[PDB]
């Protein structure tokens, strides 16, 4: 509340709490972390990315996004945690310190502000954006169906009323469009991670096609390593594989897009649990989720810095 050291990481926060946190952290580590506004959401809320950097030109960078699907509250919670941890581990953890010395990290905690507000406001289980319009009384697009990676194919609904609506066209949602433009403009991203919940999966491309990525052996071996890492803390068991194979065919997904942009290291995480609590994971499992997912992510990032 008064400092990032006083913020309660073991509870779920609202939008303004999260935003105010961002500003604290920036304040406490001005040499390490910047706040960027890459856009504004459908209902005009600012969209923020934290950049963690030790300097340099346009260093290779790591993208992380959380909270694309608003009801997956454990993601935004992990995101806050990550932010602090980056600030904590730099100069303490030799590994993490080798990473930031050579790459930047871009973290988007609340990818989907509007639907986030709406989960607190009115329906806890809202998933989509809050876009309106057209020949529909139904609001919102499945932002993780809106990307230009086999847009509109099977694995997404063309019904506005659908929980998996894909929207009117690829990149129609300003929440997506804004990441698209920013990553295309940066042009030096090496990894692209998107955090979801639940069902404990680590996923690489594709979702939209049966076709194998050419990097399949590496990304699988990376996935494998990551999963092994994560499990090490608390013994949380994760399955890994390509989307379509592991979860289901899904079109217009983040990772397919990123990967098609030449960002080799594209992974999505589906965090705890497996169905016991589902989206309404207990405040008590925040920290132990964050810690373990951490190791998973840190393993991807070391692989990244190394190849």
Ligand X SMILES: O=C(O)C[C@@H](Cc1ccccc1)C(=O)O
- Closest to Zn ion by CB, 178 vs 268, is 268
- Closest to ligand X by CB, 42 vs 204, is 204
Check whether 248 is labelled as a binding-site residue. yes
**Contact set for ligand X, span 198-237 (CB under 6 A):** 203, 207
Q: Which residue is nearest to ligand X (CB)?
A: 253
Positive or negative: CA dihedral 71, 190, 182, 108 = positive
247 contributes a contact to ligand X by CB under 6 A: yes
Check whether 71 is labelled as a binding-site residue. yes
d(CA 221, CA 224): 5
Q: Among 4, 131, 144, 200, which residue interacts with ligand X (rule: CB under 6 A)?
A: 144
227 binds, among ligand X, Zn ion, none (CB under 5 to 8 A by kind): none
254 contributes a contact to ligand X by CB under 6 A: yes
- Closest to ligand X by CB, 39 vs 207, is 207
Name which of 122, 131, 126 is nearest 40 in CA terms. 131
Non-local (6+) Cβ contacts of 211 within 8 A are none
Q: Is 270 a catalytic residue?
A: yes
Cβ 67 vs Cβ 122: under 8 Å: no
For the bound state, the minimum distance from the C-beta of residue 148 to ligand X, rounded and expressed in Å, comes to: 13
d(CA 19, CA 6): 15
Binding site for Zn ion (CB under 5 A): 69, 196
For 271, phi and psi rounded to 5 degrees?
Answer: -85, 180
Q: Is the peptide bond before 274 cis (omega within 30 degrees of 0)?
A: no
Coil vs helix vs strand at 33: strand
Helix (H) or strand (E) holding 116: helix 113-121
- Closest to Zn ion by CB, 69 vs 190, is 69
For 229, phi and psi rounded to 5 degrees?
Answer: -45, -55
Q: Which residues pair with 108 in a beta bridge?
A: 65
Of residues 108, 175, 270, 292, which has the active-site annotation?
270
d(CA 201, CA 146): 21
69 contributes a contact to ligand X by CB under 6 A: yes
**From 35-43, 45-53, 183-191, 247-255, span contacting ligand X (CB under 6 A):** 247-255
For the bound state, the minimum distance from the C-beta of residue 142 to ligand X, rounded and expressed in Å, comes to: 7
d(CA 19, CA 47): 10
Binding annotation: 69-72, 127, 144-145, 196-198, 248
Catalytic residues: 270
Binding annotation for substrate: 69-72, 127, 144-145, 197-198, 248
Positions touching ligand X (CB under 6 A) are 69, 144, 196, 203, 207, 243, 247, 250, 253-255, 268, 270
């Amino acid at each position: 509340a008064r400092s990032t050291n006083t913020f309660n990481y073991a509870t779920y926060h609202t939008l303004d709490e999260i935003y105010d946190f961002m500003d604290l952290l920036v304040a406490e580590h001005p040499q390490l972390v910047s706040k960027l506004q890459i856009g504004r959401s459908y209902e005009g809320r600012p969209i923020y990315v934290l950049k963690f950097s030790t300097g340099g030109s346009n260093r290779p960078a790591i993208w992380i996004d959380l909270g694309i699907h608003s009801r997956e509250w454990i993601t935004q919670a992990t995101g806050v945690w990550f932010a602090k941890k980056f600030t904590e581990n730099y100069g303490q953890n030799p590994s993490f310190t080798a990473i930031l010395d050579s790459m930047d990290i871009f973290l988007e905690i609340v990818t989907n502000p509007n639907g986030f507000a709406f989960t607190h406001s009115e329906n806890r289980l809202w998933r989509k954006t809050r876009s309106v319009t057209s020949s529909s009384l139904c609001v919102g697009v499945d932002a993780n169906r809106n990307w230009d990676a086999g847009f509109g194919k099977a694995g997404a609904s063309s019904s506005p009323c659908s929980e998996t609506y894909h929207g009117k066209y690829a990149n129609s949602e300003v929440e997506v469009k804004s990441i698209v433009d920013f990553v295309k403009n940066h042009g030096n991203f090496k990894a692209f991670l998107s955090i979801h919940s639940y069902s404990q999966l680590l996923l690489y491309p594709y979702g939209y096609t049966t076709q194998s990525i050419p990097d399949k052996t590496e990304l699988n071996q990376v996935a494998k390593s990551a999963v092994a890492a994560l499990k090490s803390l608390y013994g949380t068991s994760y399955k890994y594989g390509s989307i379509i194979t592991t979860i289901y065919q899904a079109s217009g997904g983040s990772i397919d897009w990123s990967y098609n942009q030449g960002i080799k290291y594209s992974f999505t995480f589906e965090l705890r649990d497996t169905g016991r609590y589902g989206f309404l994971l207990p405040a008590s499992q925040i920290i132990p989720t964050a810690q373990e997912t951490w190791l998973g992510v840190l393993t991807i990032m070391e692989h990244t810095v190394n190849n």
